[PDB]
Design a binder for these strands. Structure first.
Lengths: 65, 189, 62, 314, 132, 138
RNA sequence: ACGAGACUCUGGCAUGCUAACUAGUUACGCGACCAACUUCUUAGAGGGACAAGUGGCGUU
């Protein structure tokens, strides 16, 4: 996952004293479509679709005006 | 018509006891016409114990670095002049065939004591298979040295190998070496 | 020196400076069954039958 | 009220039976569904001396199928598995005749329209479509579509007018004619999942399956609530008597047979083998397939054994 | 070793708690339902989760396990919490009372009660464990 | 209308073209027991005498046998005979005779349906072979 | 929250699937009675193994 979830940049900064190297690593977020992040999720991340609130009477009774 | 080999059979060899099949076990798919079944006996322990003692006997001649493992050799050995001896005997070699080696076997080997001291060895044993086949391994060395730089060669010891195979009485040599060691280490009981 | 059939009940472990002997406990089946412990060598599998050619060899433990 | 007697056993198989389909018009082809690339035939003998003979082993299916449906004529079998694939089989040639790979999503069910006019499948685009044999777009409805996957589309099981009865696992039931296809009533917020809906031969009932076991009953004109028959676990089979009004299903270990005037079982008397081990779990029953009219019944389990019984009905 | 990590264990617990309806005892059916009702990004991990789900289904078929709070077993337990006997266990016709508590009740202005039976006090003062 | 899974093992193979005809068994492309290496003739002699002529009295077989390696093409001949018999009886007569005779053949020995999965493994890091390492000095 | 695992690549398995004029072939075929909807090789959307089943040890 580090191959497609982390992008790395190594750059050299030249000062009058010498060279200091910087290293920027960003862990992209998971996003389907948009090319902002990788399409696949972390392989150790398991997802469950969440139910909604259900407060209902005992038996359905049709209602007409 | 389920008779083993082309000569033997599984319908008349009965002991009326189902506790003494630790030497010959021909009752299922494991029965072999010719031992060249391939396989790996070093993949896991208790698998070289699962070996048929005929296959272990013939294969365990896989020693030196140049004759090691070559199954063509053992199958040719156990085929050549065995095909001759079957038609040349006619009678039953069963008597000696069983009665020298397969109860020549020892009854105890030894183990190390404490943390130091190489002057005596505590006598132990195993359920017979490991000790009998350790005698068989030292007998592999012994029959080799009876051929190794010697007169009676390989691929012609079929009588003695059937002795080393079959079932129950005492005449062997490396086994009595093991029995000398047996008594020496057994003086510790 | 009788021949007695006994079943392995538990495997204790090895002993020695580097480890060269194996400990099992074997119980008799036809000798007023009781628990006797004995050291052993080689592949003596889980709950196999160990043959006692003698009822007096013990395992000196530790 | 129904008395039966188990008369024998059946030995020798590789694939335990999954789904049942038969056509009274042609009784010479009997099919069984398995999981090891395996489909097995039967025949009918009704003998104690010979209650089964392995004759022909149908192959070909790469994936374990969900719903197998036969046309009105006992000549074509449609086994489309859980990928969007299909297998068309004809007894005239004894091999494959029409293999279709045209759906790029994970499809679960496939069916033949009883009038052989349109092909329906469930796709994951929140849209239902009607497809022809010529690959030409006919009717795609984007508005008021199902909240989740469309399970299948059912039609009448006998020589009668075909009526579209759309079903889904999203607990939504839609019954459409061939002219309107108009959403009349919708009710949401249901306690249990929907397995599938069934079509009545007298055209007044449409039962459903679920883990709650509550049989869903709706009329044909509208969505009037009528009655909620009880049930056990996940239901996978519902069918009436071909000439009489009854409901039979196997949602678990025993048989749950209800008469729509009584709605409750009468007397559960069964035969099960004994096991000498205290921890040997018994198998699970799925369906009861009537032989011809309700006189005889067959069943399969998870024990490589096929259990049959002889019923006197009354 | 075959120790399941927190990933498969927690996924199995959540799957069982949330979809206890559909899961059974068969590995193949549990595998199929686990693939349906969860986005498991690997097939090895899906198989591991399904196997632990089968193991835990066997566990809960033999009693309650602490990690999962399925609604049926919670309903059964709560029903057991409301059990009330026909007659109160405190509705004893006779209550055995020592002389000292009877004297206390006399000082408590409750000395006329007839439910109380005065028992013989134990003549042994041997109530402490021996020291050692 | 194409029922063939032929006969393979290890490296070798044999195309099991099984068809209805006069019913004579063609083996080795050569007379039965004179194979030039000579090493493993007797294994071929178990089933052909075990089963009988009438069982294989209608089997016209045409096999393209190739591949070097005794343990490969040998024992693959027996895999092919078992599998061709299985397919023939299944597609032609019934399943009960199939299970009976196939059970006999594959209960004689197991190693038919399963070959060794063992393969030469990669030469590893800084050593002459897969596990051996170059000698270390101090 | 990292690391470990998961993961990627690699081996090992298909009376299965997708098809190849560079492997592989059926009685109106010759050079011989004296245009197989694809399977051995190649490589793809998949399948397959989970300590899953059984037995025994394990505040079961």
């Amino acid at each position: 996952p580090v191959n497609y979830y982390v992008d790395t940049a190594v750059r050299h900064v030249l000062l009058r004293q010498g060279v200091l190297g910087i290293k920027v690593k960003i862990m992209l977020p998971w996003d389907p479509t948009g090319k902002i992040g990788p399409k696949k999720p972390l392989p150790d991340h398991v997802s469950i679709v969440e139910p909604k609130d259900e407060i209902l009477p005992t038996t359905p009774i049709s209602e007409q005006k | 018509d389920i008779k083993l080999f082309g000569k033997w059979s599984t319908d008349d060899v009965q002991i009326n006891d189902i506790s003494l099949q630790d030497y010959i076990a021909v009752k299922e798919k494991y029965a072999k016409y010719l031992p060249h079944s391939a396989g790996r006996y070093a993949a896991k322990r208790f698998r070289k114990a699962q070996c048929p003692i005929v296959e272990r006997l013939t294969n365990s001649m896989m020693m030196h670095g140049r004759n090691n493992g070559k199954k063509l050799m053992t199958v040719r050995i156990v085929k050549h002049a065995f095909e001759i001896i079957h038609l040349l005997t006619g009678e039953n070699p069963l008597q000696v065939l069983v009665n020298a080696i397969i109860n020549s076997g020892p009854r105890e080997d030894s183990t190390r004591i404490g943390r130091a001291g190489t002057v005596r060895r505590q006598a132990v044993d195993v359920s017979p298979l490991r000790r009998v086949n350790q005698a068989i391994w030292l007998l592999c060395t012994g029959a080799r040295e009876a051929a190794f730089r010697n007169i009676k060669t390989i691929a012609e010891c079929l009588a003695d190998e059937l002795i080393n195979a079959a079932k129950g009485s005492s005449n062997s040599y490396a086994i009595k070496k093991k029995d000398e060691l047996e008594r020496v280490a057994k003086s510790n009981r | 020196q009788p021949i007695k059939l006994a079943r392995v009940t538990k495997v204790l472990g090895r002993t020695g400076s580097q480890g060269q002997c194996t400990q099992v406990r074997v119980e008799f089946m036809d000798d007023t069954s009781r628990s006797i412990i004995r050291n052993v060598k080689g592949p003596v599998r889980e709950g196999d039958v160990l043959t006692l050619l003698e009822s007096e060899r013990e395992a000196r433990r530790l | 009220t129904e008395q039966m007697t188990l008369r024998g056993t059946l030995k020798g198989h590789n694939g335990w039976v999954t789904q049942i389909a038969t056509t009274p018009q042609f009784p010479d082809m009997i099919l069984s569904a398995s999981r090891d690339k395996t489909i097995i035939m039967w025949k009918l003998t009704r003998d104690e001396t010979n209650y089964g003979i392995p004759q022909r082993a149908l192959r070909g299916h790469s994936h374990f199928v969900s719903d197998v449906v036969i046309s009105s004529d006992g000549q074509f079998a449609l086994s489309g598995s859980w990928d969007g694939t299909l297998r068309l089989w004809d007894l005239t040639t004894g091999t494959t005749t029409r293999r279709f790979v045209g759906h790029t999503k994970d499809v679960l069910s496939v069916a033949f329209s009883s009038d052989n006019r349109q092909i329906v499948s469930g796709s994951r685009d929140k849209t239902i479509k009607l497809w022809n044999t010529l690959g030409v777009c006919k009717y795609t409805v984007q508005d008021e579509s199902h909240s989740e996957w469309v399970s299948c589309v059912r039609f009448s099981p006998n020589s009668s007018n075909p009526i579209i009865v759309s079903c889904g696992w999203d607990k939504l039931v839609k019954v459409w004619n061939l002219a309107n296809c108009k959403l009349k009533t919708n009710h949401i917020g249901h306690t249990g999942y929907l397995n599938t809906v069934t079509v009545s031969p007298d055209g007044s009932l449409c039962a459903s399956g679920g883990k709650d076991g509550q049989a869903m009953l709706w009329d044909l004109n509208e969505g009037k609530h009528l009655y909620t028959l009880d049930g056990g676990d996940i239901i996978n089979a519902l069918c009436f008597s071909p000439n009489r009004y009854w409901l039979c299903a196997a949602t678990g270990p025993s048989i749950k047979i209800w008469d729509l005037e009584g709605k409750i079982i009468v007397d559960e008397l069964k035969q099960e083998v004994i096991s000498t081990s205290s921890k040997a779990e018994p198998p699970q029953c799925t369906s009861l397939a009537w032989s011809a009219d309700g006189q005889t019944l067959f069943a399969g389990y998870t024990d490589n054994l096929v259990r049959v019984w002889q019923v006197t009905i009354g | 070793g075959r120790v399941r990590t927190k990933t498969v264990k927690k996924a199995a617990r959540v799957i069982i708690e949330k979809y206890y309806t559909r899961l059974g005892n068969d590995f193949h059916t549990n595998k199929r339902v686990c693939e349906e009702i969860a986005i498991i990004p690997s097939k090895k991990l899906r198989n591991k989760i399904a196997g632990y789900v089968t193991h835990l289904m066997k566990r809960i078929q033999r009693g309650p396990v602490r990690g999962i709070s399925i609604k049926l077993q919670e309903e059964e337990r709560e029903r057991r919490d409301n059990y009330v006997p026909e007659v109160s266990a405190l509705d004893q016709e006779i209550i055995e009372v020592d002389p000292d508590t009877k004297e206390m009740l006399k000082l408590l202005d409750f000395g006329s009660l007839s439910n109380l039976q005065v028992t013989q006090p134990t003549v042994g003062m041997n109530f402490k464990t021996p020291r050692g | 209308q194409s029922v063939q899974v032929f006969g393979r093992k290890k490296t070798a193979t044999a195309v099991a073209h099984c068809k209805r005809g006069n019913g004579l068994i063609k083996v080795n492309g050569r007379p039965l027991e004179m194979i030039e290496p000579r090493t493993l003739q007797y294994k071929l002699l178990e089933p052909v005498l075990l089963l009988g002529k009438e069982r294989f009295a209608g089997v016209d077989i045409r096999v393209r046998v190739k591949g070097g390696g005794h343990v490969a093409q040998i024992y693959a001949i027996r895999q092919s005979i078992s599998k061709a018999l299985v397919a023939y009886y299944q597609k032609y007569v019934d399943e009960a005779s199939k299970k009976e005779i196939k059970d006999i053949l594959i209960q004689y020995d197991r190693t038919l349906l399963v070959a060794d999965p063992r393969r030469c493994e990669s030469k590893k890091f800084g050593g002459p072979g897969a596990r051996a390492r170059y000698q270390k000095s101090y």
